[PDB]
Amino acid sequence: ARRRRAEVRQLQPDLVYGDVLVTAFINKIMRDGKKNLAARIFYDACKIIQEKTGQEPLKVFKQAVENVKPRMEVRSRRVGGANYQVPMEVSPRRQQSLALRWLVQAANQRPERRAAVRIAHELMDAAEGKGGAVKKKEDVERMAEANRAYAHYRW
Amino acid sequence: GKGDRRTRRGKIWRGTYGKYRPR
Amino acid sequence: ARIAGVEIPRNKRVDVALTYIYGIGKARAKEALEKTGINPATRVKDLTEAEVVRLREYVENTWKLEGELRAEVAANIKRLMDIGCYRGLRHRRGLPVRGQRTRTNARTRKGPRKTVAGKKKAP
RNA sequence: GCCCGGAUAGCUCAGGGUAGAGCAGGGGAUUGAAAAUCCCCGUGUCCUUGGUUCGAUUCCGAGUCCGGGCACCA
RNA sequence: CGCGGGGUGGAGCAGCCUGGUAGCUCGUCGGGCUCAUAACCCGAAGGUCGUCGGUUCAAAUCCGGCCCCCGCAACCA
RNA sequence: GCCCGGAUAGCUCAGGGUAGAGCAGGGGAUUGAAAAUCCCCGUGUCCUUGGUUCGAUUCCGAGUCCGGGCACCA
RNA sequence: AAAAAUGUUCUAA
RNA sequence: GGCGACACACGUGCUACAAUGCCCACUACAAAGCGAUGCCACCCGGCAACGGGGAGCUAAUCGCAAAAAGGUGGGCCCAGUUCGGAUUGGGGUCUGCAACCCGACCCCAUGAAGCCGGAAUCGCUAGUAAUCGCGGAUCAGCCAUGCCGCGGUGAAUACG
Ligand SMILES: [K+]
Ligand SMILES: [Mg+2]
Ligand SMILES: [Mg+2]
Ligand SMILES: [Mg+2]
Ligand SMILES: [Mg+2]
Ligand SMILES: [Mg+2]
Ligand SMILES: [Mg+2]
Ligand SMILES: [Mg+2]
Ligand SMILES: [Mg+2]
Ligand SMILES: [Mg+2]
Ligand SMILES: [Mg+2]
Ligand SMILES: [Mg+2]
Ligand SMILES: [Mg+2]
Ligand SMILES: [Mg+2]
Ligand SMILES: [Mg+2]
Ligand SMILES: [Mg+2]
Ligand SMILES: [Mg+2]
Ligand SMILES: [Mg+2]
Ligand SMILES: [Mg+2]
Ligand SMILES: [Mg+2]
Ligand SMILES: [Mg+2]
Ligand SMILES: [Mg+2]
Ligand SMILES: [Mg+2]
Ligand SMILES: [Mg+2]
Ligand SMILES: [Mg+2]
Ligand SMILES: [Mg+2]
Ligand SMILES: [Mg+2]
Ligand SMILES: [Mg+2]
Ligand SMILES: [Mg+2]
Ligand SMILES: [Mg+2]
Ligand SMILES: [Mg+2]
Ligand SMILES: [Mg+2]
Ligand SMILES: [Mg+2]
Ligand SMILES: [Mg+2]
Ligand SMILES: [Mg+2]
Ligand SMILES: [Mg+2]
Ligand SMILES: [Mg+2]
Ligand SMILES: [Mg+2]
Ligand SMILES: [Mg+2]
Ligand SMILES: [Mg+2]
Ligand SMILES: [Mg+2]
């Protein structure tokens, strides 16, 4: 935005866990406005996660989210007229967004037929340091460690 | 799909009725 | 090679398998089964040899199928081409037959595009 | 004929306890792009056979092929 | 009928040596960017290899005749 | 004199079933009108004559008019 | 502290 | 008769390439509009389009009307398929003096391309985008997937 910052739409905590981080993740599964379907998927995957390795789902979800937040990423610059890959630290809001986005994106990569299973399994791998969204987060952090020479082109 | 007239979904699309969408 | 001359694929339900016969859509698959007392859900793999011939006999005798249907379809196109009616000229030159415009698409009937050069501008 | 060597991923080249690195190629990040750049990824009987050793790229033999060099030519 | 070299997409050049595989740059055509053009970017098409004849399972490639086109030579007086 | 090579529309030139083009000019589209661009049009007994052929502007021969060159001698 | 050329004739209402 | 042509080229859209999907059955919740050779309840014939009967309403009363996605139950199991619905054969329906060129719909059969799209490129900052359906004007009918409206479900993101 040009004139003022953008203010963050505070979401409504979900009804099963009362958690805001959960609804943002539900909103990322949602397509074409079908929220109820997109809620069953996260919840069907949730019950799965209490079966496959009996653990409280809320903890397995946040452990995947916490292990997908990238602390750094490259951005573009301009100085002189040359555009490099400038490393810059990630704001907490954007870390959250990239995680949930990459989680679903990583989830829908998998070769499983039913949705909630793909959701359950990526959350399972990511909360243990494996899977699609974790390859991506590390990949992003590794590219930024590479271009630390251009860290002085930070703003 | 909506283009498949021989379905209860395609008949809704053309707004018509038939064996594949009766009333 | 079971019914008619096509092997309808096993592992599928019998109603969908029969559709793999030229001349039988889903609705005709619904008939033959019901008119012969074979559960439309039965997998082809799991039909009696008594049920094979009972399904086969009706199917092959009620309506004309595979080759004959193609020969009678071919005979009617051929007939329209022979008399020279407007539909007959369409099937000849290979253009659509049912009122569709040809300035743009008609690609299913015309085939891949044959790009030509166009008229030019002035510099 | 003799001495000296090599063969190792597609090209190049490094190497008794690993099978390596660069460039070519794959997408991805980048710009307006050509790139440079950044990233990850693959590509081997290490020429063949015996033998050594607990093991084999190595060490040995032996042949295959291609490198160098030497001498010769009735 | 002195001796050489050459003829292959539209232009200019590989491929011939060693028979089986037609290739490179530009050009040409369709799209894109631009207000528009050029440049640039993404696609595509076009050559039965001068010709006749021979060898061969198979000839642009090998052999013989003809056509065409450049180059050299023509000394002793 | 003696070979080779050019004669096709008003111009200049391509090229076995009387034939192209560009140009010149006219008309149309385009334009505010033009230029350019696109379209259409008229355009030739294809230099005479003989032969081959069902058929010749194409393949052969000659006649015409032009063009590229060969010639003391020591 | 700058990648990147060009815009037919007459007319400017 | 042509405006509907068709070696081609571009724009705007519809439908999709599937499993967050498709299919059948059951079952919920809209809004704004229209309606007297008009809208048509319900009834029988018909697989159906429709046809014949036939009430109500000059319409907050009667009708278009079922809203759809959704919720439930069940079927498909990764296939060019129970994805997709082009193309074509045959058989009908209806409006109309008349459907050859050139109508819309229905039913049997046929079941193409398409496995998410090169260079390039568009919209949207919130009840917005996306997706779901509904109505009206024109109108005999209709090539409406267009337009003008209507609500249903309902995000992501803005450091700068
Ligand atoms: K002399
Ligand atoms: Mg279907
Ligand atoms: Mg069939
Ligand atoms: Mg038409
Ligand atoms: Mg040539
Ligand atoms: Mg050439
Ligand atoms: Mg050579
Ligand atoms: Mg060769
Ligand atoms: Mg080539
Ligand atoms: Mg072009
Ligand atoms: Mg302007
Ligand atoms: Mg241009
Ligand atoms: Mg090519
Ligand atoms: Mg020759
Ligand atoms: Mg050859
Ligand atoms: Mg001398
Ligand atoms: Mg004389
Ligand atoms: Mg002349
Ligand atoms: Mg004029
Ligand atoms: Mg003559
Ligand atoms: Mg004379
Ligand atoms: Mg004279
Ligand atoms: Mg004279
Ligand atoms: Mg200039
Ligand atoms: Mg003037
Ligand atoms: Mg196109
Ligand atoms: Mg449309
Ligand atoms: Mg389009
Ligand atoms: Mg209605
Ligand atoms: Mg198919
Ligand atoms: Mg295919
Ligand atoms: Mg199908
Ligand atoms: Mg028909
Ligand atoms: Mg009609
Ligand atoms: Mg698939
Ligand atoms: Mg896309
Ligand atoms: Mg705004
Ligand atoms: Mg949809
Ligand atoms: Mg109407
Ligand atoms: Mg139509
Ligand atoms: Mg509508």
PDB file of N, CA and C in Angstrom, chain A residues 13-81:
ATOM      1  N   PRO A  13     -11.071 -17.463  15.838  1.00  0.00           N
ATOM      2  CA  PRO A  13     -10.624 -18.794  16.268  1.00  0.00           C
ATOM      3  C   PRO A  13     -11.646 -19.867  15.929  1.00  0.00           C
ATOM      4  N   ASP A  14     -11.145 -21.046  15.565  1.00  0.00           N
ATOM      5  CA  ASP A  14     -12.017 -22.145  15.187  1.00  0.00           C
ATOM      6  C   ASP A  14     -12.736 -22.693  16.415  1.00  0.00           C
ATOM      7  N   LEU A  15     -13.752 -23.517  16.163  1.00  0.00           N
ATOM      8  CA  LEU A  15     -14.629 -23.994  17.223  1.00  0.00           C
ATOM      9  C   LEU A  15     -14.146 -25.283  17.875  1.00  0.00           C
ATOM     10  N   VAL A  16     -13.300 -26.060  17.193  1.00  0.00           N
ATOM     11  CA  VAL A  16     -12.831 -27.325  17.751  1.00  0.00           C
ATOM     12  C   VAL A  16     -11.659 -27.104  18.702  1.00  0.00           C
ATOM     13  N   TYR A  17     -10.680 -26.283  18.301  1.00  0.00           N
ATOM     14  CA  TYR A  17      -9.515 -26.006  19.129  1.00  0.00           C
ATOM     15  C   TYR A  17      -9.418 -24.566  19.617  1.00  0.00           C
ATOM     16  N   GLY A  18     -10.305 -23.671  19.187  1.00  0.00           N
ATOM     17  CA  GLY A  18     -10.250 -22.291  19.659  1.00  0.00           C
ATOM     18  C   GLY A  18      -8.980 -21.558  19.291  1.00  0.00           C
ATOM     19  N   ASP A  19      -8.381 -21.899  18.156  1.00  0.00           N
ATOM     20  CA  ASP A  19      -7.044 -21.452  17.803  1.00  0.00           C
ATOM     21  C   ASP A  19      -7.088 -20.654  16.508  1.00  0.00           C
ATOM     22  N   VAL A  20      -6.333 -19.556  16.473  1.00  0.00           N
ATOM     23  CA  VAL A  20      -6.298 -18.721  15.278  1.00  0.00           C
ATOM     24  C   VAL A  20      -5.367 -19.313  14.226  1.00  0.00           C
ATOM     25  N   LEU A  21      -4.244 -19.903  14.654  1.00  0.00           N
ATOM     26  CA  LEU A  21      -3.331 -20.530  13.700  1.00  0.00           C
ATOM     27  C   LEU A  21      -4.023 -21.640  12.917  1.00  0.00           C
ATOM     28  N   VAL A  22      -5.043 -22.257  13.507  1.00  0.00           N
ATOM     29  CA  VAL A  22      -5.730 -23.358  12.846  1.00  0.00           C
ATOM     30  C   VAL A  22      -6.610 -22.846  11.711  1.00  0.00           C
ATOM     31  N   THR A  23      -7.318 -21.732  11.933  1.00  0.00           N
ATOM     32  CA  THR A  23      -8.258 -21.245  10.924  1.00  0.00           C
ATOM     33  C   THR A  23      -7.532 -20.706   9.697  1.00  0.00           C
ATOM     34  N   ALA A  24      -6.424 -19.991   9.904  1.00  0.00           N
ATOM     35  CA  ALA A  24      -5.591 -19.584   8.779  1.00  0.00           C
ATOM     36  C   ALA A  24      -5.197 -20.788   7.936  1.00  0.00           C
ATOM     37  N   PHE A  25      -4.840 -21.896   8.589  1.00  0.00           N
ATOM     38  CA  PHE A  25      -4.517 -23.111   7.851  1.00  0.00           C
ATOM     39  C   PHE A  25      -5.753 -23.690   7.169  1.00  0.00           C
ATOM     40  N   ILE A  26      -6.919 -23.604   7.817  1.00  0.00           N
ATOM     41  CA  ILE A  26      -8.154 -24.021   7.156  1.00  0.00           C
ATOM     42  C   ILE A  26      -8.433 -23.127   5.953  1.00  0.00           C
ATOM     43  N   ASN A  27      -8.208 -21.822   6.105  1.00  0.00           N
ATOM     44  CA  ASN A  27      -8.416 -20.914   4.985  1.00  0.00           C
ATOM     45  C   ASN A  27      -7.485 -21.230   3.820  1.00  0.00           C
ATOM     46  N   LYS A  28      -6.318 -21.814   4.096  1.00  0.00           N
ATOM     47  CA  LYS A  28      -5.403 -22.147   3.013  1.00  0.00           C
ATOM     48  C   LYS A  28      -5.800 -23.433   2.298  1.00  0.00           C
ATOM     49  N   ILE A  29      -6.501 -24.342   2.980  1.00  0.00           N
ATOM     50  CA  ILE A  29      -7.057 -25.502   2.293  1.00  0.00           C
ATOM     51  C   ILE A  29      -8.285 -25.125   1.478  1.00  0.00           C
ATOM     52  N   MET A  30      -8.928 -24.013   1.808  1.00  0.00           N
ATOM     53  CA  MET A  30     -10.202 -23.682   1.193  1.00  0.00           C
ATOM     54  C   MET A  30     -10.013 -23.223  -0.246  1.00  0.00           C
ATOM     55  N   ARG A  31     -10.881 -23.719  -1.127  1.00  0.00           N
ATOM     56  CA  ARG A  31     -10.853 -23.376  -2.540  1.00  0.00           C
ATOM     57  C   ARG A  31     -12.275 -23.092  -2.998  1.00  0.00           C
ATOM     58  N   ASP A  32     -12.432 -22.046  -3.811  1.00  0.00           N
ATOM     59  CA  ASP A  32     -13.730 -21.669  -4.362  1.00  0.00           C
ATOM     60  C   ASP A  32     -14.768 -21.430  -3.259  1.00  0.00           C
ATOM     61  N   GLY A  33     -14.311 -21.051  -2.066  1.00  0.00           N
ATOM     62  CA  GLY A  33     -15.192 -20.642  -0.991  1.00  0.00           C
ATOM     63  C   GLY A  33     -15.762 -21.750  -0.127  1.00  0.00           C
ATOM     64  N   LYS A  34     -15.464 -23.018  -0.419  1.00  0.00           N
ATOM     65  CA  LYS A  34     -16.070 -24.143   0.299  1.00  0.00           C
ATOM     66  C   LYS A  34     -15.315 -24.375   1.608  1.00  0.00           C
ATOM     67  N   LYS A  35     -15.712 -23.624   2.636  1.00  0.00           N
ATOM     68  CA  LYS A  35     -15.007 -23.689   3.914  1.00  0.00           C
ATOM     69  C   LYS A  35     -15.335 -24.964   4.681  1.00  0.00           C
ATOM     70  N   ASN A  36     -16.604 -25.388   4.667  1.00  0.00           N
ATOM     71  CA  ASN A  36     -17.001 -26.553   5.453  1.00  0.00           C
ATOM     72  C   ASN A  36     -16.258 -27.805   4.997  1.00  0.00           C
ATOM     73  N   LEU A  37     -16.242 -28.060   3.688  1.00  0.00           N
ATOM     74  CA  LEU A  37     -15.396 -29.119   3.145  1.00  0.00           C
ATOM     75  C   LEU A  37     -13.954 -28.965   3.618  1.00  0.00           C
ATOM     76  N   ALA A  38     -13.414 -27.748   3.513  1.00  0.00           N
ATOM     77  CA  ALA A  38     -12.037 -27.490   3.915  1.00  0.00           C
ATOM     78  C   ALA A  38     -11.828 -27.622   5.416  1.00  0.00           C
ATOM     79  N   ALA A  39     -12.896 -27.605   6.206  1.00  0.00           N
ATOM     80  CA  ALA A  39     -12.768 -27.860   7.633  1.00  0.00           C
ATOM     81  C   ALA A  39     -12.755 -29.349   7.939  1.00  0.00           C
ATOM     82  N   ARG A  40     -13.603 -30.124   7.256  1.00  0.00           N
ATOM     83  CA  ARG A  40     -13.573 -31.575   7.416  1.00  0.00           C
ATOM     84  C   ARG A  40     -12.194 -32.141   7.094  1.00  0.00           C
ATOM     85  N   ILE A  41     -11.545 -31.620   6.047  1.00  0.00           N
ATOM     86  CA  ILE A  41     -10.250 -32.151   5.623  1.00  0.00           C
ATOM     87  C   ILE A  41      -9.227 -32.030   6.745  1.00  0.00           C
ATOM     88  N   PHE A  42      -9.089 -30.830   7.316  1.00  0.00           N
ATOM     89  CA  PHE A  42      -8.158 -30.651   8.425  1.00  0.00           C
ATOM     90  C   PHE A  42      -8.543 -31.518   9.614  1.00  0.00           C
ATOM     91  N   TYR A  43      -9.842 -31.681   9.855  1.00  0.00           N
ATOM     92  CA  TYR A  43     -10.279 -32.455  11.011  1.00  0.00           C
ATOM     93  C   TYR A  43     -10.176 -33.955  10.754  1.00  0.00           C
ATOM     94  N   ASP A  44     -10.545 -34.413   9.553  1.00  0.00           N
ATOM     95  CA  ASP A  44     -10.322 -35.817   9.215  1.00  0.00           C
ATOM     96  C   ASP A  44      -8.840 -36.167   9.298  1.00  0.00           C
ATOM     97  N   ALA A  45      -7.976 -35.284   8.789  1.00  0.00           N
ATOM     98  CA  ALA A  45      -6.540 -35.464   8.970  1.00  0.00           C
ATOM     99  C   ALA A  45      -6.149 -35.410  10.438  1.00  0.00           C
ATOM    100  N   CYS A  46      -6.854 -34.603  11.237  1.00  0.00           N
ATOM    101  CA  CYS A  46      -6.534 -34.486  12.658  1.00  0.00           C
ATOM    102  C   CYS A  46      -6.760 -35.802  13.386  1.00  0.00           C
ATOM    103  N   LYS A  47      -7.966 -36.361  13.263  1.00  0.00           N
ATOM    104  CA  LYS A  47      -8.242 -37.658  13.867  1.00  0.00           C
ATOM    105  C   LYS A  47      -7.215 -38.695  13.433  1.00  0.00           C
ATOM    106  N   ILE A  48      -6.805 -38.650  12.161  1.00  0.00           N
ATOM    107  CA  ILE A  48      -5.763 -39.547  11.668  1.00  0.00           C
ATOM    108  C   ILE A  48      -4.499 -39.406  12.498  1.00  0.00           C
ATOM    109  N   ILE A  49      -4.095 -38.167  12.782  1.00  0.00           N
ATOM    110  CA  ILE A  49      -2.844 -37.935  13.483  1.00  0.00           C
ATOM    111  C   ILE A  49      -2.888 -38.424  14.930  1.00  0.00           C
ATOM    112  N   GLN A  50      -4.071 -38.478  15.552  1.00  0.00           N
ATOM    113  CA  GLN A  50      -4.202 -39.110  16.863  1.00  0.00           C
ATOM    114  C   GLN A  50      -4.130 -40.632  16.777  1.00  0.00           C
ATOM    115  N   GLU A  51      -4.448 -41.210  15.614  1.00  0.00           N
ATOM    116  CA  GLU A  51      -4.259 -42.635  15.364  1.00  0.00           C
ATOM    117  C   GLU A  51      -2.797 -42.922  15.039  1.00  0.00           C
ATOM    118  N   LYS A  52      -2.397 -42.655  13.795  1.00  0.00           N
ATOM    119  CA  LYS A  52      -1.006 -42.789  13.386  1.00  0.00           C
ATOM    120  C   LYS A  52      -0.118 -41.977  14.321  1.00  0.00           C
ATOM    121  N   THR A  53       0.655 -42.672  15.160  1.00  0.00           N
ATOM    122  CA  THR A  53       1.442 -42.052  16.222  1.00  0.00           C
ATOM    123  C   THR A  53       0.539 -41.235  17.133  1.00  0.00           C
ATOM    124  N   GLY A  54      -0.051 -41.895  18.129  1.00  0.00           N
ATOM    125  CA  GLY A  54      -0.934 -41.246  19.075  1.00  0.00           C
ATOM    126  C   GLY A  54      -0.319 -40.039  19.748  1.00  0.00           C
ATOM    127  N   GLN A  55      -0.662 -38.852  19.254  1.00  0.00           N
ATOM    128  CA  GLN A  55      -0.214 -37.601  19.845  1.00  0.00           C
ATOM    129  C   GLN A  55      -1.320 -36.574  19.674  1.00  0.00           C
ATOM    130  N   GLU A  56      -1.387 -35.631  20.605  1.00  0.00           N
ATOM    131  CA  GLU A  56      -2.410 -34.592  20.555  1.00  0.00           C
ATOM    132  C   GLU A  56      -2.248 -33.787  19.270  1.00  0.00           C
ATOM    133  N   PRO A  57      -3.237 -33.801  18.369  1.00  0.00           N
ATOM    134  CA  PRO A  57      -3.052 -33.159  17.054  1.00  0.00           C
ATOM    135  C   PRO A  57      -2.580 -31.718  17.118  1.00  0.00           C
ATOM    136  N   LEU A  58      -3.152 -30.903  18.014  1.00  0.00           N
ATOM    137  CA  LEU A  58      -2.741 -29.504  18.126  1.00  0.00           C
ATOM    138  C   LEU A  58      -1.223 -29.353  18.212  1.00  0.00           C
ATOM    139  N   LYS A  59      -0.542 -30.287  18.889  1.00  0.00           N
ATOM    140  CA  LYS A  59       0.910 -30.205  19.030  1.00  0.00           C
ATOM    141  C   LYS A  59       1.632 -30.654  17.761  1.00  0.00           C
ATOM    142  N   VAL A  60       1.109 -31.674  17.074  1.00  0.00           N
ATOM    143  CA  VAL A  60       1.749 -32.121  15.839  1.00  0.00           C
ATOM    144  C   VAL A  60       1.569 -31.085  14.737  1.00  0.00           C
ATOM    145  N   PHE A  61       0.482 -30.311  14.784  1.00  0.00           N
ATOM    146  CA  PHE A  61       0.270 -29.276  13.778  1.00  0.00           C
ATOM    147  C   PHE A  61       1.245 -28.122  13.978  1.00  0.00           C
ATOM    148  N   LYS A  62       1.324 -27.595  15.203  1.00  0.00           N
ATOM    149  CA  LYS A  62       2.193 -26.451  15.452  1.00  0.00           C
ATOM    150  C   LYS A  62       3.665 -26.812  15.322  1.00  0.00           C
ATOM    151  N   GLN A  63       4.018 -28.083  15.540  1.00  0.00           N
ATOM    152  CA  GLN A  63       5.410 -28.493  15.376  1.00  0.00           C
ATOM    153  C   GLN A  63       5.809 -28.541  13.907  1.00  0.00           C
ATOM    154  N   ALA A  64       4.866 -28.868  13.021  1.00  0.00           N
ATOM    155  CA  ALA A  64       5.119 -28.731  11.592  1.00  0.00           C
ATOM    156  C   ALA A  64       5.221 -27.263  11.201  1.00  0.00           C
ATOM    157  N   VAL A  65       4.278 -26.443  11.670  1.00  0.00           N
ATOM    158  CA  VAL A  65       4.309 -25.015  11.368  1.00  0.00           C
ATOM    159  C   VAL A  65       5.621 -24.401  11.838  1.00  0.00           C
ATOM    160  N   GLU A  66       6.036 -24.721  13.066  1.00  0.00           N
ATOM    161  CA  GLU A  66       7.268 -24.145  13.594  1.00  0.00           C
ATOM    162  C   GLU A  66       8.490 -24.609  12.813  1.00  0.00           C
ATOM    163  N   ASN A  67       8.448 -25.816  12.254  1.00  0.00           N
ATOM    164  CA  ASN A  67       9.531 -26.331  11.429  1.00  0.00           C
ATOM    165  C   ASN A  67       9.326 -26.052   9.947  1.00  0.00           C
ATOM    166  N   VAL A  68       8.545 -25.031   9.606  1.00  0.00           N
ATOM    167  CA  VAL A  68       8.458 -24.557   8.228  1.00  0.00           C
ATOM    168  C   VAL A  68       8.694 -23.060   8.107  1.00  0.00           C
ATOM    169  N   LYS A  69       8.501 -22.280   9.183  1.00  0.00           N
ATOM    170  CA  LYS A  69       8.850 -20.865   9.276  1.00  0.00           C
ATOM    171  C   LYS A  69      10.309 -20.648   8.892  1.00  0.00           C
ATOM    172  N   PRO A  70      10.582 -19.966   7.775  1.00  0.00           N
ATOM    173  CA  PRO A  70      11.974 -19.653   7.433  1.00  0.00           C
ATOM    174  C   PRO A  70      12.442 -18.373   8.101  1.00  0.00           C
ATOM    175  N   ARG A  71      13.611 -18.407   8.744  1.00  0.00           N
ATOM    176  CA  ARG A  71      14.115 -17.200   9.386  1.00  0.00           C
ATOM    177  C   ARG A  71      14.643 -16.184   8.377  1.00  0.00           C
ATOM    178  N   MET A  72      15.068 -16.626   7.192  1.00  0.00           N
ATOM    179  CA  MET A  72      15.608 -15.725   6.180  1.00  0.00           C
ATOM    180  C   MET A  72      15.106 -16.147   4.807  1.00  0.00           C
ATOM    181  N   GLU A  73      15.211 -15.218   3.859  1.00  0.00           N
ATOM    182  CA  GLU A  73      14.864 -15.452   2.464  1.00  0.00           C
ATOM    183  C   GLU A  73      15.511 -14.346   1.641  1.00  0.00           C
ATOM    184  N   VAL A  74      15.739 -14.626   0.363  1.00  0.00           N
ATOM    185  CA  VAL A  74      16.267 -13.602  -0.529  1.00  0.00           C
ATOM    186  C   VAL A  74      15.120 -12.745  -1.044  1.00  0.00           C
ATOM    187  N   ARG A  75      15.416 -11.475  -1.294  1.00  0.00           N
ATOM    188  CA  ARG A  75      14.497 -10.576  -1.972  1.00  0.00           C
ATOM    189  C   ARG A  75      15.243  -9.909  -3.121  1.00  0.00           C
ATOM    190  N   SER A  76      14.520  -9.137  -3.924  1.00  0.00           N
ATOM    191  CA  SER A  76      15.151  -8.433  -5.031  1.00  0.00           C
ATOM    192  C   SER A  76      15.535  -7.010  -4.625  1.00  0.00           C
ATOM    193  N   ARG A  77      16.477  -6.445  -5.372  1.00  0.00           N
ATOM    194  CA  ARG A  77      16.959  -5.088  -5.129  1.00  0.00           C
ATOM    195  C   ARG A  77      17.157  -4.422  -6.489  1.00  0.00           C
ATOM    196  N   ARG A  78      17.975  -3.369  -6.523  1.00  0.00           N
ATOM    197  CA  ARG A  78      17.951  -2.436  -7.640  1.00  0.00           C
ATOM    198  C   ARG A  78      19.245  -1.642  -7.787  1.00  0.00           C
ATOM    199  N   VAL A  79      20.037  -1.561  -6.707  1.00  0.00           N
ATOM    200  CA  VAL A  79      21.033  -0.499  -6.553  1.00  0.00           C
ATOM    201  C   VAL A  79      21.933  -0.431  -7.778  1.00  0.00           C
ATOM    202  N   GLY A  80      22.133   0.782  -8.282  1.00  0.00           N
ATOM    203  CA  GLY A  80      22.817   1.025  -9.551  1.00  0.00           C
ATOM    204  C   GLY A  80      21.949   0.781 -10.768  1.00  0.00           C
ATOM    205  N   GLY A  81      21.232  -0.342 -10.787  1.00  0.00           N
ATOM    206  CA  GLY A  81      20.490  -0.800 -11.944  1.00  0.00           C
ATOM    207  C   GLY A  81      20.609  -2.306 -12.054  1.00  0.00           C
TER     208      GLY A  81
END
